Swiss-Prot record, chains A, B:
GO molecular function: ATP binding; MAP kinase kinase activity; MAP-kinase scaffold activity; mitogen-activated protein kinase kinase kinase binding; protein kinase activator activity; protein kinase activity; protein serine kinase activity; protein serine/threonine kinase activator activity
Domain of life: Eukaryota
GO biological process: Bergmann glial cell differentiation; cell motility; cellular senescence; central nervous system neuron differentiation; cerebellar cortex formation; chemotaxis; endodermal cell differentiation; epithelial cell proliferation involved in lung morphogenesis
Gene (name only): MAP2K1
Modification comment: Phosphorylation at Ser-158 and Ser-162 by MAP kinase kinase kinases (BRAF or MEKK1) positively regulates kinase activity. Autophosphorylated at Ser-158 and Ser-162, autophosphosphorylation is promoted by NEK10 following UV irradiation.
Keywords: Acetylation, ATP-binding, Cardiomyopathy, Cytoplasm, Cytoskeleton, Disease variant, Ectodermal dysplasia, Intellectual disability, Kinase, Membrane, Nucleotide-binding, Nucleus, Phosphoprotein, Serine/threonine-protein kinase, Transferase, Tyrosine-protein kinase
Complexes and interactors: Found in a complex with at least BRAF, HRAS, MAP2K1, MAPK3/ERK1 and RGS14. Forms a heterodimer with MAP2K2/MEK2. Forms heterodimers with KSR2 which further dimerize to form tetramers. Interacts with KSR1 or KSR2 and BRAF; the interaction with KSR1 or KSR2 mediates KSR1-BRAF or KSR2-BRAF dimerization. Interacts with ARBB2, LAMTOR3 and RAF1. Interacts with MAPK1/ERK2. Interacts with MORG1. Interacts with PPARG. Interacts with isoform 1 of VRK2. Interacts with SGK1. Interacts with BIRC6/bruce. Interacts with KAT7; the interaction promotes KAT7 phosphorylation. (Microbial infection) Interacts with Yersinia YopJ.
Catalytic reaction list: L-seryl-[protein] + ATP = O-phospho-L-seryl-[protein] + ADP + H(+); L-threonyl-[protein] + ATP = O-phospho-L-threonyl-[protein] + ADP + H(+); L-tyrosyl-[protein] + ATP = O-phospho-L-tyrosyl-[protein] + ADP + H(+)
Effect upon mutating S90A: No loss of activity
Regulation: Ras proteins such as HRAS mediate the activation of RAF proteins such as RAF1 or BRAF which in turn activate extracellular signal-regulated kinases (ERK) through MAPK (mitogen-activated protein kinases) and ERK kinases MAP2K1/MEK1 and MAP2K2/MEK2. Activation occurs through phosphorylation of Ser-158 and Ser-162. MAP2K1/MEK1 binds KSR1 or KSR2 releasing the inhibitory intramolecular interaction between KSR1 or KSR2 protein kinase and N-terminal domains. This allows KSR1 or KSR2 dimerization with BRAF leading to BRAF activation and phosphorylation of MAP2K1.
Residues of the full protein shown: 62 to 381 of 393
Outcome when changing S158D: No effect on BRAF-KSR1 dimerization
Name of protein: Dual specificity mitogen-activated protein kinase kinase 1
Binding site for U0126: K37, D148, F149, G150, V151
Amino acid sequence: MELKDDDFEKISELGAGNGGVVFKVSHKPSGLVMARKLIHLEIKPAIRNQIIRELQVLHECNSPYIVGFYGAFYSDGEISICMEHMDGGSLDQVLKKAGRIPEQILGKVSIAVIKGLTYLREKHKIMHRDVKPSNILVNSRGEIKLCDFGVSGQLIDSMANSFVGTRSYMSPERLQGTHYSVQSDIWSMGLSLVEMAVGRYPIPPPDAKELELMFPMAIFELLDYIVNEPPPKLPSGVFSLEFQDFVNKCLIKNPAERADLKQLMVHAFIKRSDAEEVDFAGWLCSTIGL
Amino acid sequence: MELKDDDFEKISELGAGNGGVVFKVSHKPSGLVMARKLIHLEIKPAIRNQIIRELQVLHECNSPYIVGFYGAFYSDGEISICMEHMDGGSLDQVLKKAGRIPEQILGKVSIAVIKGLTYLREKHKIMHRDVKPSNILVNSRGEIKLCDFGVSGQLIDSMANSFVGTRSYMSPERLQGTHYSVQSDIWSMGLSLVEMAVGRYPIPPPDAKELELMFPMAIFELLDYIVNEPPPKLPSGVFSLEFQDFVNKCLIKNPAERADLKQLMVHAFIKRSDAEEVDFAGWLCSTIGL
Ligand SMILES: Nc1ncnc2c1ncn2[C@@H]1O[C@H](COP(=O)(O)OP(=O)(O)O)[C@@H](O)[C@H]1O
Ligand SMILES: Nc1ncnc2c1ncn2[C@@H]1O[C@H](COP(=O)(O)OP(=O)(O)O)[C@@H](O)[C@H]1O
Ligand SMILES: CC(=O)c1cc(C(=O)NOCCO)c(Nc2ccc(I)cc2F)n1C
Ligand SMILES: CC(=O)c1cc(C(=O)NOCCO)c(Nc2ccc(I)cc2F)n1C
Ligand SMILES: [Mg+2]
Ligand SMILES: [Mg+2]
């Protein structure tokens, strides 16, 4: 059935980002609980219908590694995207309560991300464009899913006008120009894993003594770091050599030398995590409360 | 009297920016029309009261060059700032309808900005922090006023997390570090004048043949331009030498060599515009429709 504005009832607020709020809502006719994302945009009636028309491809996105989609519509200067509600939140929320995410678990996250990026590329011919912890959602039945990928050419456009002014997960090639594509997503995933592995955004890298301690930067300064300085590493010693090398392979500045989806899929760290009997479900509740 | 949420009625939307919507509203008990800015923030009950308490100094800001303030309060995860409604909008809106703002008029804008920055510094000991066309508001009775300056230390904090991802009006010293202060505002004003003088954001500078034509950039690319490349100039010929030199004085990369408020106040371009009988009121309506 068709989703429309009067059929919803607000339950609570799941969070906000740039120009978009996300509500936990009830779809009154179906009884279903959904997450409803609202994007406020000053756009003509014609292009909005393009946006909505381009958003319909989400109905064709069906993967255990991709957040479920219910439908998209336009309401009060708002574009609504209605998704499956992930009771576990995003991994940045999870990191905030957990402090640091264990390697074995990052192993599972990494598999879900690679499998999701692969799905989008193979079946839909698109890159993600916004891989970061907050766009990796998890739930109580143990599933790990990507959200907030760019399906709509026109929506990518009307949203060009702003980005997160502190942390960037953008690849050095994307920070410098047009010359980027899918390899860019590898960089963001790599950076996200380091953040989650370590307990904080990894640029600038942890101080010599700040390292065995665990175990405010300016806009240009930060970006100039990503572009011109050696990429972040996992600290030597407390992570397996295979993990260290996997993120090393992800964080290579040159996008052609950097590893791609098909090489990471057969990487030692994945082969290994793919074998492991890990109770992701049980871990997520033990750490957050479900 | 005290402003509160149920005493308001929405009239229309004046616009939006980062995390903040602005409504044209009616204050039902007084009958007054106001602009009401809402800032949505995930913040504890204690710091919010600090924010509100810090916002009260706006009651003490009374200058014909500073947008009027009615009051500030907290409502539904929203911080409300209620201001005088400026029926002329901001100068970016004005530029959009006008295409290009005449020199004589920029003369008046420049005087209003300098006089407003001076007021804030002399009487309140604060810098603006966000000088740009959209924070210069104008009205039908011909007044030119600054808005959106940082009065609240704590609010500056909870708002650190995002900035405009395309155009920056930030000074090179502010893009590179903590080492900035009031001189930074001079840079932004300078850049704003060039934009308004010329009809578009002046970085990168107009192409050789794109110049007598009038008469898509990446994040790092743009910032790297502001920091490492020569500052934008007005085109030679169609602006007075005095204007060209005034913005030159504003756009000096070194903040100590750059001109300050007291030097610009006695600059040839100001001395001259200060004499001129300019019908700003009449111009603003002739161009926008009042
Ligand atoms: N489908 C969902 N289920 C549960 N929580 C969600 C969902 N989508 C978004 N959220 C939460 O709402 C927050 C706001 O998301 P968004 O507007 O996409 O901002 P961000 O830039 O943080 O991704 C996200 O950080 C996430 O915590
Ligand atoms: N007091 C006001 N009177 C009339 N219009 C206003 C007022 N304040 C803001 N606006 C309009 O609302 C828009 C949204 O403003 P804001 O949230 O401060 O975003 P910006 O970053 O564009 O300044 C502004 O661009 C301006 O056009
Ligand atoms: C570009 C495009 O197609 C697009 C961009 C975004 C997005 O949510 N960006 O978030 C920024 C918040 O600050 C988006 N949303 C989106 C995409 C897939 C799914 I499953 C859920 C979603 F909400 N789309 C479908
Ligand atoms: C920091 C601080 O004190 C502060 C920051 C801002 C602000 O509006 N920023 O806008 C960003 C929108 O994207 C703000 N607002 C503000 C300040 C003065 C006046 I007169 C009206 C206002 F709405 N204050 C009072
Ligand atoms: Mg998101
Ligand atoms: Mg503003």
